[PDB]
Write an enzyme that holds these catalytic residues in place. Structure first.
Site, PDB file in Angstrom:
ATOM      1  N   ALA A  10       0.807  -1.222   0.000  1.00  0.00           N
ATOM      2  CA  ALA A  10       0.000   0.000   0.000  1.00  0.00           C
ATOM      3  C   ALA A  10       0.844   1.279   0.000  1.00  0.00           C
ATOM      4  CB  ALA A  10      -0.940   0.000   1.193  1.00  0.00           C
ATOM      5  N   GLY A  11       0.312   2.320  -0.642  1.00  0.00           N
ATOM      6  CA  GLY A  11       0.890   3.659  -0.722  1.00  0.00           C
ATOM      7  C   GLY A  11       0.016   4.671   0.001  1.00  0.00           C
ATOM      8  N   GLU A  12       0.491   5.927   0.148  1.00  0.00           N
ATOM      9  CA  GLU A  12      -0.274   6.962   0.863  1.00  0.00           C
ATOM     10  C   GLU A  12      -1.504   7.482   0.078  1.00  0.00           C
ATOM     11  OE1 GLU A  12       1.284  11.159   0.979  1.00  0.00           O
ATOM     12  OE2 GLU A  12       3.271  10.225   0.781  1.00  0.00           O
ATOM     13  N   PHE A  13      -1.576   7.215  -1.244  1.00  0.00           N
ATOM     14  CA  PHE A  13      -2.697   7.639  -2.096  1.00  0.00           C
ATOM     15  C   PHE A  13      -3.533   6.470  -2.649  1.00  0.00           C
ATOM     16  CE2 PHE A  13       0.524  11.092  -2.442  1.00  0.00           C
ATOM     17  CZ  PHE A  13      -0.202  12.132  -1.905  1.00  0.00           C
ATOM     18  N   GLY A  14      -3.144   5.246  -2.300  1.00  0.00           N
ATOM     19  CA  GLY A  14      -3.831   4.038  -2.737  1.00  0.00           C
ATOM     20  C   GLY A  14      -2.990   2.787  -2.614  1.00  0.00           C
ATOM     21  N   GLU A  15      -3.024   1.942  -3.656  1.00  0.00           N
ATOM     22  CA  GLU A  15      -2.305   0.666  -3.697  1.00  0.00           C
ATOM     23  C   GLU A  15      -1.054   0.695  -4.592  1.00  0.00           C
ATOM     24  OE1 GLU A  15      -5.879  -1.160  -5.188  1.00  0.00           O
ATOM     25  OE2 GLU A  15      -6.444  -1.970  -3.217  1.00  0.00           O
ATOM     26  N   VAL A  16      -0.108  -0.225  -4.321  1.00  0.00           N
ATOM     27  CA  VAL A  16       1.137  -0.429  -5.068  1.00  0.00           C
ATOM     28  C   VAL A  16       1.128  -1.910  -5.463  1.00  0.00           C
ATOM     29  CG1 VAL A  16       3.653  -0.074  -5.162  1.00  0.00           C
ATOM     30  CG2 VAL A  16       2.274   1.318  -3.588  1.00  0.00           C
ATOM     31  N   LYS A  34       1.281   2.119  -9.360  1.00  0.00           N
ATOM     32  CA  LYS A  34       0.676   2.848  -8.241  1.00  0.00           C
ATOM     33  C   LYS A  34      -0.741   3.267  -8.657  1.00  0.00           C
ATOM     34  CE  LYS A  34       2.713   6.364  -5.773  1.00  0.00           C
ATOM     35  NZ  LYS A  34       3.708   7.467  -5.748  1.00  0.00           N
ATOM     36  N   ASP A 127      15.397  12.140   2.778  1.00  0.00           N
ATOM     37  CA  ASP A 127      15.079  10.825   3.325  1.00  0.00           C
ATOM     38  C   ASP A 127      15.946   9.683   2.736  1.00  0.00           C
ATOM     39  OD1 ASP A 127      13.719   9.039   4.981  1.00  0.00           O
ATOM     40  OD2 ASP A 127      11.910   8.981   3.744  1.00  0.00           O
ATOM     41  N   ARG A 131      16.065   1.862   3.149  1.00  0.00           N
ATOM     42  CA  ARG A 131      14.637   1.581   2.972  1.00  0.00           C
ATOM     43  C   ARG A 131      14.043   2.271   1.730  1.00  0.00           C
ATOM     44  NH1 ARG A 131      14.835   4.620   7.459  1.00  0.00           N
ATOM     45  NH2 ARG A 131      14.337   6.823   7.122  1.00  0.00           N
ATOM     46  N   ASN A 132      14.715   3.335   1.233  1.00  0.00           N
ATOM     47  CA  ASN A 132      14.350   4.130   0.055  1.00  0.00           C
ATOM     48  C   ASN A 132      15.313   3.872  -1.104  1.00  0.00           C
ATOM     49  OD1 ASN A 132      11.884   5.468   0.712  1.00  0.00           O
ATOM     50  ND2 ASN A 132      12.987   6.991   1.934  1.00  0.00           N
ATOM     51  N   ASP A 145      11.855   7.046  -3.776  1.00  0.00           N
ATOM     52  CA  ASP A 145      10.964   7.843  -2.929  1.00  0.00           C
ATOM     53  C   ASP A 145       9.535   7.716  -3.466  1.00  0.00           C
ATOM     54  OD1 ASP A 145      10.562   9.388  -0.611  1.00  0.00           O
ATOM     55  OD2 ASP A 145      10.913  11.316  -1.616  1.00  0.00           O
TER      56      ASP A 145
HETATM   57  C1  LIG Z   1       9.485  -7.083  -2.687  1.00  0.00           C
HETATM   58  C2  LIG Z   1       8.894  -5.710  -2.930  1.00  0.00           C
HETATM   59  O1  LIG Z   1       8.103  -5.216  -2.133  1.00  0.00           O
HETATM   60  N1  LIG Z   1       9.296  -5.123  -4.086  1.00  0.00           N
HETATM   61  C3  LIG Z   1       9.046  -3.819  -4.584  1.00  0.00           C
HETATM   62  C4  LIG Z   1       8.503  -2.778  -3.826  1.00  0.00           C
HETATM   63  C5  LIG Z   1       8.355  -1.527  -4.351  1.00  0.00           C
HETATM   64  C6  LIG Z   1       8.813  -1.228  -5.664  1.00  0.00           C
HETATM   65  C7  LIG Z   1       8.718   0.050  -6.335  1.00  0.00           C
HETATM   66  N2  LIG Z   1       8.177   1.124  -5.692  1.00  0.00           N
HETATM   67  C8  LIG Z   1       7.766   2.345  -6.262  1.00  0.00           C
HETATM   68  C9  LIG Z   1       8.484   3.514  -6.037  1.00  0.00           C
HETATM   69  C10 LIG Z   1       8.055   4.707  -6.598  1.00  0.00           C
HETATM   70  C11 LIG Z   1       6.898   4.750  -7.350  1.00  0.00           C
HETATM   71  C12 LIG Z   1       6.184   3.590  -7.575  1.00  0.00           C
HETATM   72  C13 LIG Z   1       6.607   2.389  -7.027  1.00  0.00           C
HETATM   73  N3  LIG Z   1       9.177   0.217  -7.582  1.00  0.00           N
HETATM   74  C14 LIG Z   1       9.728  -0.852  -8.169  1.00  0.00           C
HETATM   75  N4  LIG Z   1       9.871  -2.082  -7.694  1.00  0.00           N
HETATM   76  C15 LIG Z   1       9.406  -2.271  -6.419  1.00  0.00           C
HETATM   77  C16 LIG Z   1       9.536  -3.555  -5.845  1.00  0.00           C
END
Ligand SMILES: *CC(=O)Nc1ccc2c(Nc3ccccc3)ncnc2c1
Length: 274
Positions: A10-16, A34, A127, A131-132, A145
């Site tokens: 999950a993201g702050e504006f919906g789902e990931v 996203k 940040d 983790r980022n 980010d």
């Molecule tokens: C294992 C796992 O959770 N893999 C992910 C997590 C997130 C992510 C993203 N995040 C992201 C960042 C900015 C905008 C939109 C999405 N991007 C690409 N791969 C992963 C993998």
């Protein structure tokens, strides 16, 4: 064009979610999608899309690439390249002691190259933490980010982020002048980078351990600095110490960090001194 495979978080504006993208002419690739929540406000739609405009301004091999943005259909989507090995912190915690020093310096050189690109454009991240940082199948590290809402929380009593009038602040990753006076510059990102270096050399340990968020600020003011992680080359620790100088004008620039890392890669025997 786009088809969602599995909701990864999950993201702050919906789902990931993880999905697939079919570009006209090019091969099908795995992408991160996203989505904007059903029943969104005027401000929420502006804020979700402005984050895509920030990411869309950058083109570099160590910065997360924005593939495209869906705006015609509701719900709206932000599409970025998929990072198979996920967040750098969890990835290092699962692969403890599985990489040589050369491979870790290589991961650090990429983050430093990505941060140098951001510094050129007068962009302050605010940040920078493992983790980022997202990792792909080829172990290429990318500065990220505006990703997942969830993150690793070792102790909720000493939370990663502390609320501030301007914004949330990650005490353990932030420069003392940034904490004290909100002086966020490319020099305060350098302090953060030093922390990231220590995260990479310790394979995802918690900066400052048991110490409270308040004890960290106090210790830092009394000139305490994190010790070298187990079997960490002296040159790398010395670099972390340059990043953590109280005088922000003496800290290296990201271009200087890249040059020192390239120098250590050119003379790998220097990385034996522990
Ligand atoms: C294992 C796992 O959770 N893999 C992910 C997590 C997130 C992510 C993203 N995040 C992201 C960042 C900015 C905008 C939109 C999405 N991007 C690409 N791969 C992963 C993998």
């Amino acid at each position: 064009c786009v088809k969602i495979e599995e909701v990864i978080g999950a993201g702050e504006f919906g789902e990931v979610c993880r999905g697939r993208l079919k570009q006209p002419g090019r091969r099908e690739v795995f992408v991160a999608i996203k989505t904007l929540k059903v029943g969104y406000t005027e401000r929420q739609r502006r804020d979700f899309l402005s984050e895509a405009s920030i990411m869309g301004q950058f083109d570099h091999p160590n910065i997360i690439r924005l593939e495209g943005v869906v705006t015609k259909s509701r719900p709206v989507m932000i599409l970025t390249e998929f990072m198979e090995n996920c967040a750098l912190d969890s990835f290092l915690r699962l692969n403890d002691g599985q990489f040589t020093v050369i491979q870790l310096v290589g991961m650090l050189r990429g983050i430093a190259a990505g941060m140098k690109y951001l510094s050129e454009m007068n962009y302050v991240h605010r940040d920078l933490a493992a983790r980022n940082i997202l990792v792909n199948s080829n172990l290429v590290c990318k500065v990220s980010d505006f990703g997942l809402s969830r993150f690793l929380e070792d102790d909720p009593s000493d939370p990663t982020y502390t609320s501030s009038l301007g914004g949330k602040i990650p005490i353990r990753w932030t420069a003392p002048e940034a904490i004290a006076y909100r002086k966020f510059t490319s020099a305060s990102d350098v302090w953060s980078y030093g922390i990231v270096m220590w995260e990479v050399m310790s394979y995802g340990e918690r900066p400052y351990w048991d110490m409270s968020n308040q004890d960290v600020i106090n210790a830092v003011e009394q000139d305490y600095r994190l010790p070298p992680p187990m079997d960490c080359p002296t040159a790398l620790h010395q670099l972390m110490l340059d990043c953590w100088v109280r005088d922000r004008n003496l800290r290296p620039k990201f271009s200087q960090i890249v040059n020192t890392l390239d120098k250590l890669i050119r003379n790998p025997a220097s990385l034996k001194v522990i």
